Ligand binder design. Structure first.
Ligand SMILES: *[C@H](C)[C@H]1/C(=C/c2[nH]c(/C=C3N=C(/C=C4\NC(=O)C(CC)=C4C)C(C)=C\3CCC(=O)O)c(CCC(=O)O)c2C)NC(=O)[C@@H]1C
Ligand SMILES: *[C@H](C)[C@H]1/C(=C/c2[nH]c(/C=C3N=C(/C=C4\NC(=O)C(CC)=C4C)C(C)=C\3CCC(=O)O)c(CCC(=O)O)c2C)NC(=O)[C@@H]1C
Ligand SMILES: *[C@H](C)[C@H]1/C(=C/c2[nH]c(/C=C3N=C(/C=C4\NC(=O)C(CC)=C4C)C(C)=C\3CCC(=O)O)c(CCC(=O)O)c2C)NC(=O)[C@@H]1C
Ligand SMILES: *[C@H](C)[C@H]1/C(=C/c2[nH]c(/C=C3N=C(/C=C4\NC(=O)C(CC)=C4C)C(C)=C\3CCC(=O)O)c(CCC(=O)O)c2C)NC(=O)[C@@H]1C
Ligand SMILES: *[C@H](C)[C@H]1/C(=C/c2[nH]c(/C=C3N=C(/C=C4\NC(=O)C(CC)=C4C)C(C)=C\3CCC(=O)O)c(CCC(=O)O)c2C)NC(=O)[C@@H]1C
Ligand SMILES: *[C@H](C)[C@H]1/C(=C/c2[nH]c(/C=C3N=C(/C=C4\NC(=O)C(CC)=C4C)C(C)=C\3CCC(=O)O)c(CCC(=O)O)c2C)NC(=O)[C@@H]1C
Ligand SMILES: *[C@H](C)[C@H]1/C(=C/c2[nH]c(/C=C3N=C(/C=C4\NC(=O)C(CC)=C4C)C(C)=C\3CCC(=O)O)c(CCC(=O)O)c2C)NC(=O)[C@@H]1C
Ligand SMILES: *[C@H](C)[C@H]1/C(=C/c2[nH]c(/C=C3N=C(/C=C4\NC(=O)C(CC)=C4C)C(C)=C\3CCC(=O)O)c(CCC(=O)O)c2C)NC(=O)[C@@H]1C
Ligand SMILES: *[C@H](C)[C@H]1/C(=C/c2[nH]c(/C=C3N=C(/C=C4\NC(=O)C(CC)=C4C)C(C)=C\3CCC(=O)O)c(CCC(=O)O)c2C)NC(=O)[C@@H]1C
Lengths: 161, 169, 161, 157, 161, 157, 161, 157, 161, 157
């Protein structure tokens, strides 16, 4: 994975020169935003279970997915979907702390669509769940931090679609 | 070594339950059969030589190769050793019958028996068979004497066999 | 053994030990004897030599005896809670070496995993061999290392090699 | 970067960052001003550091391919010195030696042995560069720079 | 591991003979007792948690063992003691079902004293807990089945002492 | 014995016997009297089973060590037949092929290859012994005895 | 793997017949050339590092491939390229000694193009470096042995194409 | 062949052939004329070797599937003898038992057990074939052939 | 392990000096005996299973060891004894080829006594079996090579006591 | 020794040595006389080889710890040269590089790094010693000597 600093270092190293003033400005911006990122990470860590509960309740419950023959039927598949949502939330928090989306690409979205298609996991339902998770996180942490986490939630949703 | 009463009394302090109902019941049950144990020991002691002789003769009937050349009972030296060891087994089984406890067998009969028998090449199968033959002869003599509830007489012999025989299953 | 001329050469007592163990259940030792138990150290196969300072105490272990082992409590948190009650000093609990499998453009200059590739390879060598090998000794396995870094083989296959 | 190290340390336990990791993260982001200042110092003084270190290294080690009379070899050596100063600046910015290790430390011995350049000479040049760079910074400010120079030297040796 | 039938078969097999009438009578006794053995196994399985709870309550709780500095202090050690009592109960049930104590010799008592002395586990408290468990099981399943289970409980306790 | 298999199956999962294990145990305990009767039948008829099976086996497979004019080889073969009948009786008593497997099946190929006894001949002898033993019992009594004989035959191939 | 003698043996064996006189003549030719093949193998073993450094110096150095952003930028990629060239030289020597290219097709070229495409390694630069290595080896070991090794170098280049 | 064996030995340590492997290679290529001559001897005399060996084998083991009045079985056995002589010639040419091992030794027991051909009979037949083959060779030329015949027999037993 | 050449090399090396003329003479003796050693190894390889069969027939069959209740009773214990004899024969051949008993001490004898004592294997019977194996080998091979192999068979027998 | 290598290779597969391995063993023991002669040649000429190689090595590499004016360091370098000549003689005797690798090659870099001796200088000295040794020997006998000198040089580089 990479964070903001490592991404700037990579962009500068490919062309073989020190960080130009624009890269240093972006680095200073990330350093300033670090405190807000830490507070958001603490809040999401404290309310992860509630976030996933509300996401499932407002996105997947009482649909054909949880009915017999659906993909969330049986306790094993329900637990697997809840675990996937846990993964999405935790790695979105990781990406928000890092300032870069590369952790999502490397650990989450790397061949996730193919795995879901082979297993039979509805991609559209998962995207709707990710959007609902973004809404829940926004309602919990606020508008600014909400949209900061929503950037990575939208990255996950776009990588799934 | 310990007898049944000593082991039970020491366990009374060891387990922390003291002299509770189960211990009293087991003690009463054991003491009910004490006279029969003494009688069985008296019968065994009064007929020891006959029991050992009968058992060894039956053993050589069921294992005719033992007394043939190359067998383990070959020559009078090894025959005498057979008789001596079967007398050992009978004596300690009578001790265990009197005591009501198998600790005498553990301490003075079975400790290091397997090592000795491996060193000397003494076959364990015929040893177990001879012990069982002696047990059967003792049971026959006890039935002849008129004894009725003599299940405990089986306990030492069988136990000794289970301790000396190799694991097949 | 006492009547032999080598009796004054054995220093460990031979009588009191056997007499004590006569009254006890099977010892805590290998079924093939105390000489089959290596020292539980970081590296090196240190065994009691039969002929040097002899103190063998054989016991009649049958084919069905199962040894009692003290769990160290190590492992990832997901692979726990079934045997989490063990605790052994000198155990690196959650510090297990794990390498997720790899899945047309060249990689970034700085891509960071939990352990760098040389660090992970050194950890694998230190676990399999107990310690780091000397300088040239890794030459025969270089190709294998390459196949581990390119995702051709898993960590299990690397360990087997 | 140490931010990545914290995130992956939390990831190995499959848990959110603990308060200890958050404290480390906050302490790190509070030193961004100093790290950017040190990186600017290294970028501005790269050429003078390279020249002075080259002079001292050629004085100490006169029999080296850098000053064997081949101008191309001299230019390549000075470019390598500048590149390693750049990597050390990257490491100072990231807070850890991971960028330097990934770019110019893993396989450095193999690369330079293929290039047929003695590794002891490169160690001496790194020492000269370190002593030139330390003099341009204050104490409690060039500790990480000296640590990264020692990291390069240790990888070479 | 050997049960009653396997023990009789072994004793007959070392002599190379079919089962004699005495061993056949013992086998018939075991077959007759099998129904009671199955009932006792069912009863102990149904109440295993309650049996261990009562054993701990009447033998270990509110003593210096659960106090700080005791061996049942901290949650891990308390859970490990409960786990050990579960082990003893389950293996006593196994031995009762088999009608033979060899399972306890090969899987419980082998090296148990050395392991407990190495860990600092109090042997006397363990023996008293096993006695309490035997009393609880006897009160639960009756006098006859209680005595039959107590045979193997006493085998465990005697091995520990 | 089947009881040991049930207990070991439960122990493999670190749990008390499940209802399936309990049902197997109860069925076996119920059938124990019939098993004892079958074992007694096998014990009291062992010699005639051996004789008739040997006659049929030498008629069907005359080229065997037991039919080579050697009295000792014939005696050893008939003793082996008696031993295998005894092991099958043990297995009938125990409700499982465990006694037969542990005493006369594991390593049977190695033992008989060391003795240079053809394995196909032993399979044929086992088949003849099975044919002669099954005639002495009812069909339901023969149901398990045939299975144990088949187990020996399968292990020899 | 398969060498010249095994190739002839398999060609004869697929028809279930002994080696016909043409196969025996080819076998005699291989036996006669074996001395020169061993001499070439000894020379290449002695000058392996020199061959690889000359190959890199005359093929890949001072081009865009070693400038920042190139595939031979950073020390780890340079070391990987050098290791790959060492593999090419060693397995070409193996193939020359064996008199067959089967070892090259089994250990080197099997999926090499796919791996290089996945990593972004330039195939054209690798082919050029293989040609340079062939020229260097020809200079070192002379004309006849030079083209004998060049057969397998060209086989490697064709496999990469 | 031995060339592939020594190349694989060198490759197992990821290094060029050591002087021991080079000496093995040189000693192998210096005996090419002798190996070709031995292979030609085996090919020319294959039929007479098969006939004489089969005669001796049927004298020593009269009761075997190859002489039971079945023409096809006799033809198949003699074909097998010729095939094994061919494989031994391959092994002599290659300088290693590898060709024989791949073509007629790996899974030979399974193949001949599927065919219900006793393995010890094949061992005796191979012994007779070895006796016939070594009697038309030089004293020094018989070492490799005897070793390969022993290899076949050992793989069968 | 260690053979004759390595033994002489180490004897010279602990003193830090070249091989003295006596060591050179011993090395020449080993070099001259190598042909006989190779012939003996070939002979033992050809008839290994026959040698073990004759050994078992000569020393173990029709004794109380193979009778019911004996240690070679049941098929698994018979096969285990045969496996041990196979190990003894193979390692005696190894030691004869090497000209040293070092491999026997390292691989076979270091712990065999305690293992046999734990298993209950009669050591006197296995010593008699090894001596019978020595007789079988000396009858198969000859007098001189039989004596050479009997050196290592005697070393095994001495190490078993 | 190559005998130990063959035996260990056979033992890893739990099988008797294959015919190819027996051929390797026979060919090795066949050439023992030449190996003893070469080892005697190396032993007799060790001192003059060390002297001439030291002269060439100090002429070519004057900035080395040996000729830094320390008599003990010079003596230790000479002793190391003699020791490596002795180990090469051992390897010639054993037919394999196992003696040299097990006495003076495994851990050579660690030992000389702890001693703070530049490894390139040791490589140059080994090359000079190899040239001196190859001077006083026929090429056919010098094949293994040069191979083992190259083995040492590769282990140091
Ligand atoms: C009743 C005994 C207890 C209880 C239950 C309760 N459940 C829900 C909702 C759901 N229950 C399920 C259950 C399952 N899904 C499966 O795949 C399986 C395995 C066959 C089971 C058992 C699911 C999926 C839901 C979600 C709704 C849906 O069906 O789509 C509720 C309502 C939850 C809510 O917040 O609306 C309740 C109340 N509640 C109690 O108090 C009892 C102890
Ligand atoms: C929940 C929103 C939806 C859903 C999910 C679902 N997923 C699986 C199975 C898998 N999920 C993953 C995903 C990951 N594993 C990882 O390690 C990571 C990164 C940390 C991710 C993103 C994988 C790999 C699998 C396959 C393996 C496994 O099952 O663990 C299931 C189970 C499918 C089955 O039939 O077994 C389910 C149900 N399904 C829905 O319907 C939701 C919309
Ligand atoms: C050096 C100060 C002295 C010395 C040391 C020496 N040690 C060995 C070999 C071994 N050393 C160990 C020790 C450890 N094992 C562990 O797990 C740990 C903790 C991490 C330690 C310190 C072991 C197990 C060995 C065995 C071999 C191996 O490397 O695995 C040797 C080599 C001896 C040999 O015969 O191989 C030496 C020389 N010797 C001295 O004379 C110094 C005073
Ligand atoms: C100077 C301190 C020392 C010196 C160096 C030297 N280097 C070269 C040539 C090259 N140097 C590099 C360096 C790197 N490539 C990378 O990817 C990295 C990681 C960031 C580094 C540091 C490379 C690739 C080359 C090859 C040429 C090229 O750049 O394409 C030379 C010339 C070699 C030649 O033979 O032409 C020299 C002399 N020499 C010394 O003596 C100093 C100790
Ligand atoms: C209070 C918040 C809740 C509760 C508690 C409760 N606990 C007990 C008894 C015990 N509690 C412990 C606790 C610990 N042991 C440890 O080692 C640690 C970690 C350091 C802890 C927390 C123990 C050992 C006992 C056993 C009694 C003893 O003192 O040895 C009780 C009494 C139960 C009983 O009498 O059987 C209670 C009630 N009960 C509630 O309702 C709260 C939710
Ligand atoms: C409870 C009655 C008493 C008590 C127990 C206690 N035990 C441990 C730890 C262990 N117990 C065992 C025992 C077994 N493991 C097995 O597999 C078997 C056979 C089925 C047995 C009998 C072991 C191996 C351990 C070690 C740790 C582990 O679980 O692997 C503890 C904790 C010891 C520690 O601190 O590590 C305790 C407290 N202690 C008492 O005071 C009670 C009287
Ligand atoms: C008869 C069906 C076949 C056959 C028999 C045959 N047996 C032997 C000799 C032995 N048989 C055994 C068998 C066993 N040992 C065990 O422990 C068990 C498990 C219970 C068995 C079955 C053994 C050990 C021997 C060796 C002699 C001894 O008892 O010590 C022979 C060989 C006789 C000889 O000495 O030549 C033979 C021939 N022969 C046939 O033809 C039938 C196919
Ligand atoms: C050098 C001439 C060119 C070059 C090479 C290069 N290769 C890699 C990476 C790999 N190379 C291989 C090849 C092999 N590994 C083997 O084990 C074998 C058989 C013995 C072969 C042929 C593999 C598998 C990889 C991937 C795994 C690894 O990294 O080791 C790299 C690194 C690429 C990266 O992005 O890390 C490079 C640079 N590149 C050039 O530009 C040269 C023309
Ligand atoms: C045969 C001559 C005598 C005989 C042997 C016998 N051995 C076993 C079992 C084992 N023997 C060993 C011994 C070794 N371990 C080693 O590392 C080596 C060197 C390579 C040897 C020789 C081992 C490990 C076993 C395994 C025991 C197990 O079953 O786990 C048996 C079987 C014993 C049993 O109880 O099953 C036998 C019979 N016995 C005789 O009576 C012959 C005289």
């Amino acid at each position: 994975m990479q964070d903001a600093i490592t991404a700037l270092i990579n962009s500068s190293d490919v062309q073989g020169r020190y960080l130009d003033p624009s890269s240093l400005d972006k680095l200073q911006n990330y350093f300033q935003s670090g405190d807000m990122r830490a507070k958001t990470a603490i809040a999401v860590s404290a309310n992860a279970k509630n976030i996933v509960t509300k996401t499932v309740a407002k996105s997947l419950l009482y649909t054909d997915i949880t009915a017999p023959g659906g993909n969330m039927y049986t306790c094993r598949r329900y637990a697997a979907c809840v675990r996937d949502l846990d993964y999405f939330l935790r790695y979105a928090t990781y990406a928000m702390l890092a300032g870069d989306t590369s952790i999502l690409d490397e650990r989450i979205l790397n061949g996730l669509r193919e795995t879901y298609n082979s297993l039979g996991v509805p991609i559209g339902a998962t995207i709707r769940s990710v959007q609902a998770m973004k809404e829940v996180v926004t309602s919990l942490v606020g508008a600014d931090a909400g949209r900061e986490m929503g950037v990575y939630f939208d990255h996950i949703a776009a990588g799934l679609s | 070594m310990q007898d049944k009463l000593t082991s039970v009394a020491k366990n009374c302090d060891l387990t922390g339950s003291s002299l509770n109902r189960e211990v009293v019941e087991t003690l009463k049950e054991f003491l009910a059969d004490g006279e029969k144990r003494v009688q069985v020991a008296g019968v065994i002691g009064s007929n020891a030589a006959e029991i050992v002789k009968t058992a060894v003769s039956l053993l050589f009937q069921e294992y005719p190769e033992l007394v043939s050349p190359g067998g383990n009972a070959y020559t009078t030296r090894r025959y005498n050793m057979y008789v001596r060891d079967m007398n050992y087994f009978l004596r300690y089984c009578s001790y265990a019958i009197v005591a009501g406890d198998a600790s005498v067998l553990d301490e003075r009969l079975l400790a290091g028996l397997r090592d000795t028998f491996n060193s000397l090449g003494i076959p364990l199968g015929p040893t177990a068979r001879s012990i069982q033959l002696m047990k059967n002869i003792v049971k026959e003599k006890l039935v002849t004497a008129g004894m009725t509830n003599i299940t405990f007489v089986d306990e030492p012999f069988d136990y000794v066999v289970r301790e000396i025989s190799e694991t097949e299953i | 053994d006492l009547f032999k001329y080598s009796a004054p050469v054995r220093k460990v007592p031979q009588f009191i030990t056997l007499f004590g163990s006569y009254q006890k259940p099977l010892p805590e030792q290998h079924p093939y004897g105390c000489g089959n138990d290596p020292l539980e150290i970081q590296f090196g196969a240190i065994f009691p030599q039969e002929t040097r300072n002899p103190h063998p105490q054989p016991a009649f272990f049958n084919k069905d005896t199962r040894r009692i082992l003290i769990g160290s409590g190590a492992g990832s948190p997901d692979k726990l809670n079934g045997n989490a009650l063990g605790k052994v000093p000198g155990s690196l609990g959650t510090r297990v070496l794990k390498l997720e499998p790899l899945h047309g453009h060249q990689s970034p200059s700085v891509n960071l995993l939990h352990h760098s590739s040389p660090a992970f390879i050194e950890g694998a060598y230190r676990q399999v061999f107990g310690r780091s090998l000397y300088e040239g000794q890794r030459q025969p396995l270089s190709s294998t290392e390459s196949k581990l870094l390119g995702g051709e083989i898993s960590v299990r296959e690397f360990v087997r090699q | 970067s140490i931010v990545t190290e914290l995130i992956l340390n939390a990831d190995s336990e499959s848990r959110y960052p603990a308060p200890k990791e958050i404290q480390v993260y906050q302490n790190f982001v509070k030193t961004g001003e100093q790290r950017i200042r040190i990186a600017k110092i290294l970028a501005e003084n790269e050429q003078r550091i390279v020249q002075n270190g080259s002079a001292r290294f050629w004085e100490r080690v006169p029999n080296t391919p850098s000053n064997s009379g081949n101008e191309r070899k001299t230019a390549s050596c000075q470019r390598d010195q500048g590149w390693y100063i750049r990597l050390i600046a990257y490491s100072v910015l990231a807070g850890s030696e991971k960028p330097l290790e990934e770019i110019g430390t893993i396989g450095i011995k193999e690369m330079y042995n293929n290039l047929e350049i003695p590794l002891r000479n490169i160690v001496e040049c790194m020492r000269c560069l370190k002593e030139e760079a330390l003099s341009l910074m204050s104490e409690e400010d060039a500790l990480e720079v000296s640590a990264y120079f020692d990291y390069v030297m240790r990888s070479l040796s």
